[PDB]
Design a protein around this ligand. Structure first.
Ligand code: CHL
Ligand code: CLA
Ligand code: CLA
Ligand code: CLA
Ligand code: CLA
Ligand code: CLA
Ligand code: CLA
Ligand code: CLA
Ligand code: CLA
Ligand SMILES: CC1=C(/C=C/C(C)=C/C=C/C(C)=C/C=C/C=C(C)/C=C/C=C(C)/C=C/C2=C(C)CCCC2(C)C)C(C)(C)CCC1
Lengths: 95, 124, 186, 37
């Protein structure tokens, strides 16, 4: 199989559904983590290491920041190589 | 007052100076540095190539002379920089200030070396 | 509203913009203790300063026809035996670095031997501080590029650039990562 | 062990005759011109 089509194709699908299908659902479940509350309430260096010091703002209308791009892109790459690797096993000698 | 004279006070002379990069206010010091550096850098290559110690070598004369012109521009850039450090330690034009002159010296180095390189390309 | 590494991203609070080259880039929030950020800021420059000299040295050695490649310099034998080089380096570097640290603790700035700051020529200003960091960061990225390009391509920095320029689409990271047997079999 | 390399003059003569003097003169010129606080 052509790696460029399969890997890019799978990544596009996983980015497309993530942006257009599961974005609303994913955000709602992320608020279920708000009900519990913040991890720590302190002002020491080690307490600062547990806070969202940097907020990744995005200009995308739906709020599809880079962290979401990395998450859904990784799944597409993972699925893409699974498809390629399995298809490679066809026509393998002594393997 | 001072002794009036056409050379000191003439219309044609005054207009010519007012258009030179040094006297053309409203331009960023860095840009003036590049404009001044290019002009001097281009000329600086001439004498080194024609009258240098390797002037009679067919092809090495161009390279050696220009490479020495580049060196002199580097030394001049140092002179400009340290002059600003000594002169401006504490007015109308931004150039005559510690911040302005430091930009001016940097532009001269960039413009001067570009002029030396541009002069070499003209030969070959 | 200074430029930030990510469009439309307000910089984090612990980054105030006072430091030279402060683009608000700290996704992991490593620098948030004022006692560590000051140490890291000094640590950024010294890594960059060594990188800047290293990149110039590798490029200079290649441009001047020095052999062998920069990653085989140690194997070559010089006037001084390799055993004698290390004790000399350890004593000299230990002295310079120890006094480098002592001055930093007292003054909080960077210098050489007994002078802090070390600015004999008087060139020093916020612009110069900014220019040092940006050129330093570029050298740090550049040096890693040399190391990895030596691993994959096994060509010296300038040599690799010429190959890319000669054949841009034919020669690139795509070609070398799929031709390790050919390049390493030579 | 002591013998320096055969190329030592090529580096040290320009270094001590053209480079260090330039830095030394720049250091001294800035120093003398420097104004007291
Ligand atoms: C600034 C730090 C520094 C860096 C990044 C390197 C990096 C390198 N040195 Mg170098 N050296 C450095 C400082 C020094 N080296 C040496 C002396 C040597 C020698 C003698 C050799 C290297 C070699 C190597 C390479 C390691 C290859 C390997 O797996 O051998 C590691 C081998 C074992 C662990 C066994 C690599 C390019 C090797 C090389 O060039 O390979 C062709 C090599 O033979 N270096 C000295 C003493 C003067 C250094 C002093 O600071
Ligand atoms: C800015 C420095 C720089 C520049 C100008 C070049 C230029 C070149 N590289 Mg090199 N390279 C660099 C950095 C650089 N490289 C780095 C950092 C690495 C390590 C990943 C490599 C690894 C590398 C390899 C393995 C190969 C090249 C090759 C090449 C040539 C073809 C271009 C290519 O394939 O690039 C595409 C691939 C790259 C890895 C280049 C990336 C360059 C960007 C600008 C780096 C950005 C870094 C970023 C700011 C870091 C953020 C960190 C984050 C955690 C915040 C070309 C001469 C190829 C060649 O023909 O060499 C002779 C080749 O085989 N480079
Ligand atoms: C020692 C004096 C000296 C010498 C030997 C040179 C030598 C040279 N000059 Mg230069 N020049 C000088 C002083 C000198 N110049 C001065 C004082 C000025 C006035 C600012 C100029 C203005 C000047 C111009 C405008 C040009 C040259 C150019 C030349 C070249 C002319 C080649 C030829 O055969 O004709 C040569 C490299 C020409 C050049 O470089 O052409 C590529 C060119 O266009 N010179
Ligand atoms: C004033 C006296 C004088 C003159 C004219 C020369 C001339 C020369 N010497 Mg000699 N030299 C002298 C004194 C002099 N020397 C002395 C006292 C010593 C002992 C320390 C030496 C030691 C010496 C050595 C060791 C060497 C020379 C060499 C040279 C040659 C190249 C110099 C060079 O690169 O200049 C570079 C020139 C410039 C950067 C510019 C010169 C000035 C320009 C032309 C002024 C133009 C002004 C312009 C007209 C104003 C216009 C204004 C308008 C726009 C309003 C040349 C033939 C070299 C050689 O190979 O000779 C064959 C060489 O190796 N000389
Ligand atoms: C020796 C490396 C080094 C160090 C110690 C620092 C340190 C610093 N940088 Mg700098 N930086 C570096 C290299 C370094 N940088 C390089 C190479 C680049 C170019 C990609 C940058 C680009 C950069 C930007 C754009 C910004 C900083 C900023 C900062 C400051 C805040 C972040 C922090 O606390 O980082 C602490 C860092 C470390 C303790 C190093 C951790 C290294 C890990 C373990 C491995 C990383 C591997 C890598 C991704 C491959 C701090 C003074 C911010 C600032 O305000 O500066 C004034 C800022 O805006 N840096
Ligand atoms: C991090 C910086 C750094 C380091 C660690 C080295 C290390 C080395 N260089 Mg390199 N070099 C550097 C910067 C560096 N260089 C710079 C900035 C330049 C200028 C472009 C050069 C130009 C250069 C040349 C031309 C050569 C080396 C060579 C060497 C090797 C022998 C050094 C020697 O005998 O010195 C002894 C001399 C001194 C201590 C006097 C220094 C005077 C200033 C050694 C592996 C030589 C070699 O064998 O390379 C394979 C060699 O041919 N270097
Ligand atoms: C882009 C490079 C660069 C720049 C702009 C600066 C700028 C600065 N450095 Mg840094 N430095 C650098 C590279 C640089 N450095 C490198 C590579 C080293 C290791 C040798 C150092 C080691 C160093 C020390 C130890 C100290 C500084 C300090 C300073 C400050 C005063 C000196 C100055 O203005 O130099 C201006 C620089 C230039 C005009 C550029 C010079 C270009 C060279 C000559 C080219 C060499 C080519 C090569 C041989 C091939 C200033 C903020 C001092 C400081 O922090 O004071 C508070 C200080 O103590 N620097
Ligand atoms: C005060 C004593 C003294 C004097 C007057 C000279 C004079 C000279 N030396 Mg020598 N030198 C000396 C001590 C001295 N040296 C010592 C103690 C050493 C051992 C490190 C050397 C190592 C040395 C070398 C490697 C070279 C010279 C060279 C030279 C010549 C040019 C200057 C130079 O490059 O110096 C450079 C001086 C040093 C590197 C050491 C200076 C140490 C002090 C403390 C500063 C000149 C004839 C050059 C030569 O022979 O050219 C033909 C040359 O390449 N010298
Ligand atoms: C120890 C001190 C010293 C040294 C090492 C030199 C060295 C040199 N002089 Mg002499 N000179 C000196 C003192 C010195 N001089 C003094 C005190 C005076 C006044 C009395 C003179 C007056 C003088 C004149 C009038 C002339 C020389 C020239 C020369 C060159 C003669 C050999 C040749 O053919 O070069 C050929 C040169 C080259 C092929 C290029 C060499 C490299 C250039 C000059 C610089 C490159 C810089 C680089 C690109 C960027 C910066 C690098 C740096 C940061 C490391 C040579 C570069 C001649 C010459 O050609 O000068 C340019 C010449 O005409 N000198
Ligand atoms: C702007 C814009 C746009 C566009 C966009 C784009 C084009 C994007 C892209 C994106 C992308 C393109 C992304 C990507 C990502 C990726 C990633 C994130 C990856 C990851 C990976 C991984 C993680 C891997 C792993 C692994 C390995 C390494 C080995 C083997 C195994 C595995 C596979 C697992 C649009 C028009 C739409 C809209 C408007 C705007």
């Amino acid at each position: 199989l052509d790696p460029q089509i399969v890997i890019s194709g799978s990544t596009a699908a996983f980015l497309a559904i993530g942006r257009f299908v599961f974005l609303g659902y994913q955000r709602r479940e992320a608020n279920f983590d708000s009900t519990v509350g913040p991890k720590t309430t302190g002002a020491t260096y080690f307490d600062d290491l547990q806070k969202n010091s940097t907020i990744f703002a995005t200009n995308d209308p739906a709020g599809f920041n880079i962290i979401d791009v990395a998450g859904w892109g990784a799944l597409g790459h993972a699925v893409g190589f699974a498809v390629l690797a399995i298809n490679s096993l066809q026509g393998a000698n002594l393997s | 007052g001072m002794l009036e004279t056409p050379v000191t006070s003439a219309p044609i002379v005054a207009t010519y100076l007012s258009n030179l990069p040094a006297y053309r206010t409203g331009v960023a010091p860095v840009l003036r540095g590049v404009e001044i550096g290019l002009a001097h850098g281009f000329l600086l290559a001439g004498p080194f190539i024609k009258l240098g110690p390797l002037r009679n070598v067919p092809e090495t004369a161009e390279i050696a002379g220009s490479l020495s012109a580049a060196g002199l521009v580097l030394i001049l850039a140092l002179c400009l920089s340290i002059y600003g450090s000594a002169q401006f330690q504490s007015a109308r034009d931004p150039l005559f200030s510690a911040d302005g002159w430091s930009e001016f010296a940097a532009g001269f180095l960039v413009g001067g070396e570009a002029g030396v390189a541009w002069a070499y390309v003209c030969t070959q | 509203a200074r430029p930030t590494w990510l469009p439309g991203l307000n910089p984090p609070a612990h980054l105030k913009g006072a430091l030279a080259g402060d683009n608000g880039f700290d996704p992991l929030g490593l620098g948030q203790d004022e006692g560590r950020l000051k140490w890291y800021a000094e640590a950024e420059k010294t890594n960059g300063r060594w990188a800047m000299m290293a990149v110039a040295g590798i490029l200079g050695q290649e441009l001047l026809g020095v052999t062998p490649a920069w990653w085989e310099a140690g194997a070559k034998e010089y006037d001084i035996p390799a055993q004698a080089l290390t004790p000399i380096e350890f004593i000299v570097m230990g002295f310079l670095e120890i006094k480098r640290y002592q001055g930093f603790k007292q003054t909080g700035t960077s210098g050489f031997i007994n002078s802090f700051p070390f600015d004999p020529a008087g060139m020093n200003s916020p612009s110069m501080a900014t220019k040092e960091v940006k050129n330093g960061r570029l050298a740090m990225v550049a040096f890693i590029g040399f190391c990895v390009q030596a691993l994959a391509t096994r060509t010296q920095p300038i040599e690799g650039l010429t190959a890319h320029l000669a054949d841009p689409f034919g020669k690139n990271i795509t070609y070398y990562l799929t031709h390790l047997p050919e390049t390493l079999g030579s | 062990p002591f013998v320096p390399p055969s190329w030592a003059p090529s580096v040290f003569v320009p270094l001590t005759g053209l480079v260090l003097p330039a830095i030394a003169m720049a250091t001294l010129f800035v120093y003398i011109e420097k104004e007291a606080p």
